[PDB]
Design an enzyme around this catalytic site. Structure first.
Site, PDB file in Angstrom:
ATOM      1  CB  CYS A  62      -0.908  -0.050   1.249  1.00 34.12           C
ATOM      2  SG  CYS A  62      -1.874  -1.569   1.381  1.00 34.12           S
ATOM      3  CG  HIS A  98      11.698  10.485  12.520  1.00 32.00           C
ATOM      4  ND1 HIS A  98      11.971  11.737  12.023  1.00 32.00           N
ATOM      5  CD2 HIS A  98      12.490  10.333  13.600  1.00 32.00           C
ATOM      6  CE1 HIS A  98      12.892  12.313  12.768  1.00 32.00           C
ATOM      7  NE2 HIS A  98      13.228  11.483  13.736  1.00 32.00           N
ATOM      8  CG  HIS A 101       0.796   9.446   8.888  1.00 32.30           C
ATOM      9  ND1 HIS A 101       1.177  10.614   9.502  1.00 32.30           N
ATOM     10  CD2 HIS A 101       1.621   9.308   7.815  1.00 32.30           C
ATOM     11  CE1 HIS A 101       2.177  11.157   8.837  1.00 32.30           C
ATOM     12  NE2 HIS A 101       2.470  10.385   7.808  1.00 32.30           N
ATOM     13  CG  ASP A 105     -11.324   3.311   6.753  1.00 32.95           C
ATOM     14  OD1 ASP A 105     -12.562   3.434   6.638  1.00 32.95           O
ATOM     15  OD2 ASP A 105     -10.640   2.755   5.874  1.00 32.95           O
ATOM     16  NE  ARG A 113      -6.253   1.046   6.968  1.00 30.78           N
ATOM     17  CZ  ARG A 113      -7.398   1.654   6.610  1.00 30.78           C
ATOM     18  NH1 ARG A 113      -7.454   2.973   6.426  1.00 30.78           N
ATOM     19  NH2 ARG A 113      -8.491   0.936   6.452  1.00 30.78           N
ATOM     20  CB  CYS A 115       0.078   3.368   7.820  1.00 25.45           C
ATOM     21  SG  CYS A 115       0.711   3.567   6.136  1.00 25.45           S
TER      22      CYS A 115
END
Length: 147
Positions: A62, A98, A101, A105, A113, A115
């Protein structure tokens, strides 16, 4: 011109900053070399602190690696609002800002999530973790609490 681990992190933290500040993506590099799928951890190179496991890694399919599981120890989930919409980011106060996010959802233990950007990451094999302090690393990679 010499090159030590000090100058490694110094030059590095410029690019880590480019990601934190502007959401800057690393160029085509993030392949089998940088995020090698061999068992271990994926850590923010600035500190070498465990963010998520290779045991439960998601690949950069992704764009960036996005799994359901953070490591609760050095990862802080922190709500914000840019423009009318709220967001959550995983970000330390001093240095580890660093990370990445996280979104409400994505299904998870809290429903976030996880990420993280591949620029901030280095794969650290379970073998290399044993050199760097397995009791800190492998405890988060694999533990058991026998009652």
């Amino acid at each position: 011109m010499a090159y030590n681990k000090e100058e490694k992190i110094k030059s590095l933290n410029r690019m880590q900053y480019e990601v934190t500040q502007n959401n800057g993506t690393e160029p085509p590099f993030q392949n089998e070399y940088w995020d090698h799928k061999e068992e271990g951890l994926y850590v923010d190179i600035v500190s070498g602190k465990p963010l998520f496991t290779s045991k439960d890694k998601f690949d950069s399919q992704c764009g960036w690696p996005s799994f359901t599981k953070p490591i609760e120890e050095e990862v802080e989930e922190k709500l914000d609002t840019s423009h009318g919409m709220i967001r959550t980011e995983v970000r330390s106060r001093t240095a580890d800002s660093h990370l990445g996010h996280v979104f409400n959802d994505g299904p998870g233990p809290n429903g976030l999530r996880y990420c993280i950007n591949s620029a901030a990451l280095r794969f650290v094999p379970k073998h290399k973790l044993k050199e760097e302090g397995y009791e800190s690393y492998l405890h988060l990679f694999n533990k058991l609490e026998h009652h």
